[PDB]
Design an enzyme around this catalytic site. Structure first.
Site, mmCIF file in Angstrom:
data_model
loop_
_atom_site.group_PDB
_atom_site.id
_atom_site.type_symbol
_atom_site.label_atom_id
_atom_site.label_comp_id
_atom_site.label_asym_id
_atom_site.label_seq_id
_atom_site.Cartn_x
_atom_site.Cartn_y
_atom_site.Cartn_z
ATOM 1 N N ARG A 1 -5.365 8.969 0.396
ATOM 2 C CA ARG A 1 -6.156 8.728 1.587
ATOM 3 C C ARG A 1 -5.306 8.617 2.880
ATOM 4 O O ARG A 1 -5.689 9.173 3.914
ATOM 5 C CB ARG A 1 -7.015 7.489 1.346
ATOM 6 N N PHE B 1 -10.036 11.413 -8.772
ATOM 7 C CA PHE B 1 -9.990 10.614 -7.572
ATOM 8 C C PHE B 1 -8.750 11.010 -6.790
ATOM 9 O O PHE B 1 -7.939 11.848 -7.241
ATOM 10 C CB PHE B 1 -9.936 9.120 -7.930
ATOM 11 N N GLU C 1 -7.964 -7.754 -2.181
ATOM 12 C CA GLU C 1 -7.710 -7.147 -0.871
ATOM 13 C C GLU C 1 -6.909 -8.074 0.037
ATOM 14 O O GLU C 1 -5.937 -7.645 0.675
ATOM 15 C CB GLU C 1 -9.041 -6.769 -0.219
ATOM 16 N N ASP D 1 -10.701 -14.679 6.587
ATOM 17 C CA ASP D 1 -10.561 -16.071 6.990
ATOM 18 C C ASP D 1 -9.475 -16.695 6.138
ATOM 19 O O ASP D 1 -8.846 -17.677 6.536
ATOM 20 C CB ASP D 1 -11.904 -16.784 6.868
ATOM 21 N N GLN E 1 -5.279 0.785 5.535
ATOM 22 C CA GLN E 1 -5.730 2.087 5.098
ATOM 23 C C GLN E 1 -6.964 2.456 5.905
ATOM 24 O O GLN E 1 -7.849 1.630 6.117
ATOM 25 C CB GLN E 1 -5.996 2.137 3.591
ATOM 26 N N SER F 1 -8.048 -0.984 -6.090
ATOM 27 C CA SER F 1 -8.381 -2.275 -5.490
ATOM 28 C C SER F 1 -9.268 -3.216 -6.316
ATOM 29 O O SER F 1 -8.952 -4.393 -6.461
ATOM 30 C CB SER F 1 -9.003 -2.076 -4.133
ATOM 31 N N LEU F 2 -10.388 -2.704 -6.818
ATOM 32 C CA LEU F 2 -11.231 -3.452 -7.746
ATOM 33 C C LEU F 2 -10.420 -3.905 -8.940
ATOM 34 O O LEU F 2 -10.586 -5.025 -9.400
ATOM 35 C CB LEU F 2 -12.372 -2.596 -8.274
ATOM 36 N N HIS G 1 -9.930 4.942 5.515
ATOM 37 C CA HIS G 1 -10.582 5.769 4.519
ATOM 38 C C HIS G 1 -10.917 7.143 5.136
ATOM 39 O O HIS G 1 -11.358 7.205 6.292
ATOM 40 C CB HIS G 1 -11.840 5.067 4.049
ATOM 41 N N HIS H 1 -10.652 0.784 6.551
ATOM 42 C CA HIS H 1 -11.296 0.591 5.237
ATOM 43 C C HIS H 1 -10.754 -0.553 4.392
ATOM 44 O O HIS H 1 -11.508 -1.451 4.048
ATOM 45 C CB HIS H 1 -11.306 1.891 4.445
ATOM 46 N N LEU I 1 -18.922 3.637 4.186
ATOM 47 C CA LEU I 1 -18.207 4.470 3.238
ATOM 48 C C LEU I 1 -19.098 5.486 2.508
ATOM 49 O O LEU I 1 -20.134 5.110 1.965
ATOM 50 C CB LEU I 1 -17.477 3.566 2.233
ATOM 51 N N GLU J 1 -14.724 8.230 -2.027
ATOM 52 C CA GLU J 1 -13.701 9.237 -2.282
ATOM 53 C C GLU J 1 -14.042 9.935 -3.583
ATOM 54 O O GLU J 1 -13.541 11.018 -3.844
ATOM 55 C CB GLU J 1 -12.309 8.610 -2.334
ATOM 56 N N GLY K 1 -16.364 4.322 -5.657
ATOM 57 C CA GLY K 1 -15.704 5.293 -6.523
ATOM 58 C C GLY K 1 -15.320 4.759 -7.880
ATOM 59 O O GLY K 1 -15.461 5.446 -8.886
ATOM 60 N N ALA L 1 -15.646 -15.483 -3.772
ATOM 61 C CA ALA L 1 -16.401 -15.087 -4.958
ATOM 62 C C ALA L 1 -16.387 -13.564 -5.120
ATOM 63 O O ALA L 1 -17.385 -12.957 -5.515
ATOM 64 C CB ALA L 1 -17.812 -15.611 -4.873
ATOM 65 N N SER M 1 -20.770 -10.575 -1.660
ATOM 66 C CA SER M 1 -19.350 -10.305 -1.420
ATOM 67 C C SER M 1 -19.160 -8.799 -1.278
ATOM 68 O O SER M 1 -19.882 -8.021 -1.925
ATOM 69 C CB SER M 1 -18.465 -10.840 -2.571
ATOM 70 N N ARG N 1 -2.803 2.105 -0.028
ATOM 71 C CA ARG N 1 -3.586 1.780 -1.222
ATOM 72 C C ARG N 1 -3.913 3.036 -2.013
ATOM 73 O O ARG N 1 -4.206 4.094 -1.442
ATOM 74 C CB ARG N 1 -4.881 1.055 -0.885
HETATM 75 C C1 LIG Z 1 -14.868 -2.265 1.872
HETATM 76 C C2 LIG Z 1 -14.983 -1.371 0.678
HETATM 77 C C3 LIG Z 1 -14.010 -1.554 -0.277
HETATM 78 C C4 LIG Z 1 -14.010 -0.743 -1.396
HETATM 79 C C5 LIG Z 1 -14.953 0.263 -1.604
HETATM 80 C C6 LIG Z 1 -15.946 0.449 -0.652
HETATM 81 C C7 LIG Z 1 -15.969 -0.367 0.502
HETATM 82 C C8 LIG Z 1 -17.045 -0.130 1.542
HETATM 83 N N1 LIG Z 1 -14.887 1.028 -2.756
HETATM 84 C C9 LIG Z 1 -13.882 0.761 -3.693
HETATM 85 C C10 LIG Z 1 -13.749 1.469 -4.882
HETATM 86 O O1 LIG Z 1 -14.508 2.370 -5.196
HETATM 87 N N2 LIG Z 1 -12.734 1.174 -5.755
HETATM 88 C C11 LIG Z 1 -11.824 0.185 -5.480
HETATM 89 O O2 LIG Z 1 -10.917 -0.064 -6.272
HETATM 90 N N3 LIG Z 1 -11.936 -0.525 -4.316
HETATM 91 C C12 LIG Z 1 -12.951 -0.239 -3.443
HETATM 92 N N4 LIG Z 1 -13.027 -0.965 -2.298
HETATM 93 C C13 LIG Z 1 -12.049 -2.040 -2.025
HETATM 94 C C14 LIG Z 1 -12.549 -3.286 -2.733
HETATM 95 O O3 LIG Z 1 -13.941 -3.232 -2.954
HETATM 96 C C15 LIG Z 1 -12.273 -4.546 -1.931
HETATM 97 O O4 LIG Z 1 -11.190 -4.368 -1.030
HETATM 98 C C16 LIG Z 1 -12.022 -5.697 -2.913
HETATM 99 O O5 LIG Z 1 -12.780 -5.543 -4.104
HETATM 100 C C17 LIG Z 1 -12.442 -7.003 -2.274
HETATM 101 O O6 LIG Z 1 -12.836 -7.879 -3.293
HETATM 102 P P1 LIG Z 1 -12.247 -9.344 -3.162
HETATM 103 O O7 LIG Z 1 -12.699 -10.250 -4.278
HETATM 104 O O8 LIG Z 1 -10.742 -9.256 -3.077
HETATM 105 O O9 LIG Z 1 -12.925 -9.953 -1.832
HETATM 106 P P2 LIG Z 1 -14.415 -9.562 -1.365
HETATM 107 O O10 LIG Z 1 -15.190 -9.064 -2.558
HETATM 108 O O11 LIG Z 1 -14.260 -8.533 -0.264
HETATM 109 O O12 LIG Z 1 -15.155 -10.873 -0.791
HETATM 110 C C18 LIG Z 1 -14.445 -12.001 -0.329
HETATM 111 C C19 LIG Z 1 -15.038 -13.313 -0.845
HETATM 112 O O13 LIG Z 1 -14.423 -14.414 -0.192
HETATM 113 C C20 LIG Z 1 -15.358 -15.246 0.471
HETATM 114 N N5 LIG Z 1 -14.882 -15.729 1.787
HETATM 115 C C21 LIG Z 1 -14.230 -15.042 2.775
HETATM 116 N N6 LIG Z 1 -13.982 -15.882 3.810
HETATM 117 C C22 LIG Z 1 -14.473 -17.099 3.506
HETATM 118 C C23 LIG Z 1 -14.510 -18.318 4.193
HETATM 119 N N7 LIG Z 1 -14.406 -18.386 5.514
HETATM 120 N N8 LIG Z 1 -15.109 -19.393 3.587
HETATM 121 C C24 LIG Z 1 -15.663 -19.274 2.323
HETATM 122 N N9 LIG Z 1 -15.619 -18.069 1.649
HETATM 123 C C25 LIG Z 1 -15.036 -17.003 2.236
HETATM 124 C C26 LIG Z 1 -16.603 -14.404 0.615
HETATM 125 O O14 LIG Z 1 -17.721 -15.247 0.547
HETATM 126 C C27 LIG Z 1 -16.517 -13.452 -0.561
HETATM 127 O O15 LIG Z 1 -17.065 -14.018 -1.723
#
Ligand SMILES: *Cc1cc2c(cc1C)nc1c(=O)[nH]c(=O)nc-1n2C[C@H](O)[C@H](O)[C@H](O)COP(=O)(O)OP(=O)(O)OC[C@H]1O[C@@H](n2cnc3c(N)ncnc32)[C@H](O)[C@@H]1O
Ligand SMILES: C/C=C/CC/C=C/CC/C=C/CCCCCCC(=O)OC[C@H](COP(=O)(O)OCCN)OC(=O)CCCCCCC/C=C/C/C=C/CCC
Ligand code: HEM
Ligand SMILES: COc1[nH]c(=O)c(C(=O)[C@@H](C)C[C@H](C)[C@@H](Cl)CCl)c(O)c1OC
Ligand code: SF4
Ligand code: F3S
Ligand code: FES
Lengths: 613, 129, 249, 153
Positions: free
Chosen positions: A288, A121, A389, A223, A242, A405-406, A244, A355, A254, A257, A53, A17, A46, A400
């Site tokens: 980065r 950025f 991601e 996972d 990456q 990423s978002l 950070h 990161h 974090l 950036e 950023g 999600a 999530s 990256r």
């Molecule tokens: C880590 C981070 C990343 C980040 C950031 C700051 C931090 C601390 N700032 C960013 C920014 O300013 N601009 C940008 O473009 N990216 C930035 N990032 C990176 C980015 O936020 C993330 O890498 C990316 O958005 C991740 O989003 P994604 O939808 O791809 O996945 P998620 O939001 O991290 O969450 C994962 C979802 O999957 C579910 N999940 C995981 N494992 C399971 C299993 N076992 N079973 C069921 N569900 C699972 C989680 O529940 C979650 O919903």
């Protein structure tokens, strides 16, 4: 023991999600599908919510831009390991994708003329790398990823995507190379759920928790990349982790950036802007992968700061407090709350921190997972996508780009719901499940749940994380890595000496974290072995014994009558780690990086240059 | 065995489809706007009570106190008188009893100013020992 | 070596008719990090893995660690432990919530109640989903400040005794404040009907104005301030539309 | 007449009971604070006053024993003034306070004064202005009942 099973049948099931997770759900639901969304935590929890950023798009609310300059800096940031078709999608679409958010409801911060506010950025510039520094980053002030997740979430309610919150994806439903759904542990009542569905989409985010120190959330145990390793898929570019530049010295959370694109900069021991030397033009806004390596050397060479001379200062205190309110509000605090710093009077304790993970499950330009033998190209794996991601369209390649990423979740998450409103015809009905369909999934759960053994689920992680951090750090050598991969791999045995205590079902946090470790080992391992084998220096990955970037030519000497280097002996190529999870051994191979655009007529393949910021 | 029943989609709300059939506008707004304005007009009433006395105050102290309190103990009774913990019939029965409270207080007050000393000559008396 | 002693609600739902016991842990403040959560992961890993709760971000941003530390509803993750080892800090799950396990309350109600308020953007004529940015001057969007940050941790809600008592019918601080955020989004035309949804005597007006909710919010926002402003919308004063997309827009 | 959500709300409460799941400890365990306790005091006073106005109101109708007997069947074992001048204080305060806090609460109802500093001021400047008036209304005419006990001229 004894367990209770459930069946559902959906059109499309999304294991995540995230930002990617929900944008799929919501384009796919609004298109009109039986959507199930399955996540081990409630969707505002999530990691995407952590994003700070912002998000990249050429909207020029600050100064005339072209979506192409963004394509450029993106290929640059990719260090030419990045599939340019993928990036072509990423960048043309970004202009719309982002705008769509504003129309969804994202409280974008504002120009006086009410356009979306853009910050500078790290790693972007106008004019095909020959203008100034870019203002193309979009942001709800300071905690952008949060606003987008809650927005993408808000809209997820209007499109009837029956949500399956606090269920744990165990394994993919595999029947001869085609995906029919997932199988989940339901947290709230220890029951098990079998999701017959035409397609599946894996949006599980990264695996930063595979390290001692990461900016990521406790749930980032990737996972997804396990689920697919365990369904016989081969993963790529794992070694591109990456770091950070600006993670908080102690706890490891974090600082954006963004802080730098607003005018903050890095400062050493004798307090000189030590990037005005490491990257003359970009400075503290270099990519980065290069700023975090830049930082790490100043350390080993004693120009560090603190009581220890081992982290550095991020200085913001010069900027007017009236801009630290509106532009960097949420980290004025997350600094004050964790490091004692009033960001208008002192600098912030910052060390490079694990990161983001370019790495993930191989996908074509349409976000569909791929198997690939040297021979018959890259064959599609039907009924399975993945994005964000956790995915690897490599829109990122080796490094990256900040704020990509978002965008890479919103965009391809959206490119699941568009590319499925395509080749899913209202006939092809709900696939039926094989007899015993993941009986081996639950057999693992059981094994784990009653796991007698002598090593705690807890300790094991701890030592993995500690090795993983020492051996797969910023700078890696054949001696460190090679012993690493030997340690690491003795560990992926200790799983048969593993020790739980919480015997139960209903919310079994001990047991899910042990599952979460099990996965994270399949992650840990494939990462470091890839990184041990990579005899080059490009992006986040950097060798002290292979310091040159190794390409099919040499893009210092102007190519003119150079014979091409042979595909084996150069590293401008992807890394497909393929592991059987039973024995737990890995065997490599290498896909070629896709160099051509999506439409050569609209824009041209931007060819390998000197990686210099 | 993975050999057991086919399950049902989990109890979830659906803001839109559960919107369709159920559209009444019964705004408690207007009523609320007054009973504040009323306690807001009860203000100058209460210090005038320290000062002006006799059977004419007495009446409309008790006449205005009644109205505030009737609403008040309704407010109270609608809180603690949870239908969850009380069950439907016994919760109508605290809700009925709340007008029986209102109506009574008044009979009791009206009577007091009519065949006892009234409230303003009561609050004299007590303030004299 | 100073040893801080914690006291933490335990419930085991798998056990036949089990009662909720309060469990006693000591932890060495020397081999443990600064916040409480830190101490909770310590006691799960080191002492007792059955000690179950919800956690992510770890940086004060998701709200999954919301629980009741030393009387108050707040984020375990950004909560400093009581540095005084002669006191004894004690932890409870969000008040008047149905506990699934240990510290994990059945949040589902709170979540559904959110879903009610229709938390997306809506306009009176359709608009092209991927086209232009609706104008919103800086001064308009300052109104959403105090409002969008809400992590939905449910601290406020689970602290408002109104909500404890009538959760079924009272939307409750967290959830209301968000609805307001949608009625003063200068870009949202559903002000009208979005107010109609919470007209009745319980869902909205069941704020007996205690103020517990703003005092407990870890994110230092203010739900009362909104509720207030909503009462003003349900009765006297108005929402005021935006100055039109000033042309070249 | 329940709104779409509250229907659902009820159903939840049904499940959650059928599941024998317990309820997270609240007022037992929640820390005393100037928010709720002000309100709660505003509660207690509000009722306890109307409480009196019933067991008083009706009380005296449905009894023999009129109110003027009751003042004497107390002054008849007159206890030292201070005791009595405290029952005065108790009787006055509830009114003193509930009225103060009243005007106040309405402010909160109107979005006004809902920040944590201007809240806590609220709590004090009310809890203050009350206890002050309540003593100044019990003690001041116990004054001109002593200045008259001995007339200087
Ligand atoms: C880590 C981070 C990343 C980040 C950031 C700051 C931090 C601390 N700032 C960013 C920014 O300013 N601009 C940008 O473009 N990216 C930035 N990032 C990176 C980015 O936020 C993330 O890498 C990316 O958005 C991740 O989003 P994604 O939808 O791809 O996945 P998620 O939001 O991290 O969450 C994962 C979802 O999957 C579910 N999940 C995981 N494992 C399971 C299993 N076992 N079973 C069921 N569900 C699972 C989680 O529940 C979650 O919903
Ligand atoms: C258990 C709890 C016990 C409480 C039971 C309460 C019953 C509630 C009755 C409410 C009606 C009050 C109004 C009348 C009143 O006070 O009498 C006048 C008397 C005049 O005496 P007296 O006859 O003058 O004195 C005796 C001769 N010395 O008053 C008094 O003796 C009490 C005075 C109360 C304080 C004054 C009001 C303060 C509010 C300030 C607000 C303003 C904003 C503008
Ligand atoms: C100017 C004088 C007064 C004002 C401005 C005032 C104001 C208020 C307000 C605003 C409420 C809000 C209702 C709620 O929180 O649910 C309230 C409650 C209440 N009041 Fe008053 N009040 C005054 C005098 C009195 C007096 C003298 C009594 C006793 C006879 C009284 C009895 C009650 C009761 C029973 C409630 C029920 C709600 C609760 O206890 O929290 N009021 N008052
Ligand atoms: C809104 O007014 C209120 N104010 C409160 O202090 C409050 C509470 O927190 C209660 C512990 C106090 C209440 C008055 C008692 Cl005597 C119930 Cl046994 C309470 O439950 C309440 O109703 C929701
Ligand atoms: S108002 Fe504050 S305490 Fe409540 S859910 Fe939002 S962030 Fe949490
Ligand atoms: S505590 Fe509840 S009473 Fe209103 S002030 Fe907050 S919602
Ligand atoms: S876990 Fe994210 S708030 Fe503590």
């Amino acid at each position: 023991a004894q367990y209770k099973v459930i069946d559902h049948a959906y059109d499309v099931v999304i294991i995540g999600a995230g930002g990617a997770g929900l944008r799929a759900a919501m384009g796919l639901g609004e298109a009109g599908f039986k959507t199930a969304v399955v996540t081990k935590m409630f969707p505002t929890r999530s990691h995407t919510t952590a994003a700070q950023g912002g998000i990249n798009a050429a909207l020029g609310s600050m100064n005339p831009d072209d979506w192409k300059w963004h394509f450029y800096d993106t290929a640059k940031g990719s260090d030419w390991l990045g599939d340019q078709n993928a990036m072509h999608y990423l960048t043309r679409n970004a202009v719309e994708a982002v705008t769509e958010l504003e129309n969804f409801g994202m409280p974008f911060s504002r120009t006086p003329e009410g356009k979306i506010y853009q910050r500078s950025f790290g790693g972007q510039s106008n004019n095909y790398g020959k203008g100034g520094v870019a203002k193309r980053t979009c942001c709800v002030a300071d905690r952008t990823g949060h606003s987008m997740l809650h927005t993408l979430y808000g809209n997820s309610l209007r499109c009837h995507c029956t949500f399956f919150i606090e269920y744990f994806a165990l394994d993919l439903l595999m029947d001869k190379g085609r995906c029919v759904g997932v199988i989940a542990l339901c947290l709230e009542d220890g029951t098990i759920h079998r999701f017959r569905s035409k397609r599946t989409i894996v949006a599980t985010g990264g695996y930063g928790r595979a390290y001692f120190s990461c900016t990521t959330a406790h749930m980032n145990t990737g996972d997804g990349t396990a689920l697919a390793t365990r369904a016989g898929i081969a993963l790529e570019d794992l070694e591109f982790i990456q770091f950070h530049p600006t993670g908080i010295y102690g706890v490891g959370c974090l600082i954006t950036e963004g802080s730098r694109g607003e005018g903050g900069f890095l400062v050493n021991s004798e307090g000189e802007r030590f990037m005005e030397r490491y990257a003359p033009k970009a400075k503290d806004l270099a990519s980065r992968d290069v700023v975090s390596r830049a930082e790490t050397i100043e350390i080993m060479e004693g120009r560090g700061v603190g009581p220890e001379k081992d982290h550095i200062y991020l200085q913001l205190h010069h900027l007017p407090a009236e801009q630290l309110h509106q532009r960097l509000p949420g980290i004025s605090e997350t600094a004050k709350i964790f490091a004692g710093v009033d960001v208008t009077k002192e600098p912030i304790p910052v060390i490079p921190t694990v990161h983001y993970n370019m790495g993930g499950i191989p996908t074509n330009y349409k976000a569909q997972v791929i198997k690939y033998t040297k021979e018959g190209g890259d064959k599609i794996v039907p009924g399975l996508y993945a994005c964000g991601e956790c995915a690897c369209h490599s829109v990122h390649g080796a490094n990256r780009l900040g704020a990509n990423s978002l965008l890479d979740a919103v965009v391809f998450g959206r490119a699941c719901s568009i590319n499925i409103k395509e080749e899913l015809k209202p006939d092809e009905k709900i696939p039926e499940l094989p007899e015993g369909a993941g009986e081996e999934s639950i057999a693992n759960l059981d094994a784990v749940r009653y796991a007698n053994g002598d090593v705690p689920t807890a300790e094991l992680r701890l030592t993995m994380q500690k090795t993983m951090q020492k051996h797969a750090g910023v700078f890696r050598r054949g001696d460190i890595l090679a012993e690493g991969v030997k340690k690491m791999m003795d560990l992926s045995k200790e799983l048969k000496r593993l020790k739980t205590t919480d015997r139960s079902l209903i919310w079994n946090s001990d047991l899910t974290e042990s599952l979460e470790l099990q996965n994270l080992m399949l992650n840990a391992t494939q990462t470091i072995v890839a990184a041990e084998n990579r005899k080059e220096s490009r992006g986040a990955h950097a060798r002290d014994d292979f310091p040159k970037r190794e390409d099919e030519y040499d893009y210092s000497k102007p190519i003119e009558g150079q014979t091409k280097r042979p595909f084996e002996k150069h590293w401008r190529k992807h890394t497909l780690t393929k592991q059987d999870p039973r024995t737990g051994h890995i065997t490599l191979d290498y896909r070629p990086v896709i160099d051509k655009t999506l439409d050569p007529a609209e824009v041209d393949w931007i060819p390998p240059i000197i990686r210099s910021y | 065995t993975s050999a057991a029943v086919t399950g049902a989609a989990p109890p979830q709300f659906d803001p839109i489809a559960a919107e369709k059939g159920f559209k009444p506008l019964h705004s408690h707004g207007t009523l609320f706007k007054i009973e504040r304005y009323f306690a807001a007009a009860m203000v100058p009433l209460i210090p005038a009570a320290y000062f002006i006395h006799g059977r004419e105050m007495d009446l409309c102290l008790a006449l205005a106190l009644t109205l505030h309190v009737h609403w008040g103990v309704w407010g109270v009774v609608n809180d603690y008188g949870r239908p969850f913990v009380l069950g439907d019939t016994l919760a109508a029965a605290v809700r009925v009893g709340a007008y029986i409270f209102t109506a009574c207080l008044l009979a009791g007050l009206l009577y007091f100013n009519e065949h006892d000393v009234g409230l303003t000559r009561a609050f004299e008396m007590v303030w004299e020992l | 070596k100073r040893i801080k002693t914690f006291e933490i609600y335990r419930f085991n739902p798998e056990e036949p008719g089990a009662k909720p016991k309060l469990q006693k842990f000591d932890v060495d403040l020397d081999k443990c990090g600064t916040m409480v959560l830190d101490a909770l992961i310590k006691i799960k890993n080191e002492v007792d893995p059955t000690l179950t709760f919800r956690r992510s971000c770890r940086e004060g941003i998701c709200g999954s660690c919301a629980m009741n530390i030393a009387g108050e509803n707040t984020l375990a993750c950004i909560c400093n432990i009581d540095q005084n080892t002669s006191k004894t800090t004690k932890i409870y799950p969000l008040p008047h919530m149905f506990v699934i396990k240990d510290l994990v309350p059945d949040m589902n109600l709170f979540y559904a109640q959110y879903a009610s308020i229709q938390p997306w953007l809506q306009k009176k004529t359709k608009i092209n989903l991927g086209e232009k940015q609706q104008y919103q001057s800086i001064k308009e969007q300052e109104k959403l400040d105090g409002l969008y940050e809400c992590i939905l941790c449910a601290c406020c809600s689970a602290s408002c005794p109104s909500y404890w008592w009538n959760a079924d019918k009272y939307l409750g601080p967290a959830v209301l404040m968000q609805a307001y955020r949608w009625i003063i989004d200068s870009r949202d035309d559903s002000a009208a009907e979005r107010l109609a949804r919470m007209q009745d005597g319980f869902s909205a007006f069941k704020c007996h104005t205690i103020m517990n909710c703003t005092k407990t919010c870890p994110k230092h926002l203010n739900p009362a301030r909104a509720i207030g402003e909503i009462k003003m919308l349900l009765t006297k004063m108005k929402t005021k539309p935006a100055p039109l997309p000033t042309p070249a827009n | 007449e329940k709104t779409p959500i509250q229907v659902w709300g009820w159903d939840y409460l049904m499940r959650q009971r059928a599941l024998k799941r317990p309820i997270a400890p609240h007022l037992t365990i929640y820390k005393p604070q100037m928010t709720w306790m002000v309100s709660g005091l505003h509660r207690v006073t509000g009722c306890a006053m109307a409480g009196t106005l019933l067991i008083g109101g009706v009380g005296f109708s449905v009894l023999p024993l009129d109110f003027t007997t009751f003042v004497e069947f107390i002054r008849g074992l007159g206890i030292p003034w201070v005791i009595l001048d405290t029952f005065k204080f108790i009787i006055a305060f509830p009114i003193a306070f509930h009225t103060l806090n009243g005007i106040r609460f309405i402010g909160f109802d109107m979005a006004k004064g809902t920040d944590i500093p201007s809240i806590y001021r609220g709590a004090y400047l009310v809890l203050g202005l009350a206890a002050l008036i309540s003593l100044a209304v019990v003690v001041y005419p116990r004054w001109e009942r002593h200045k008259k006990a001995t007339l200087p001229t």
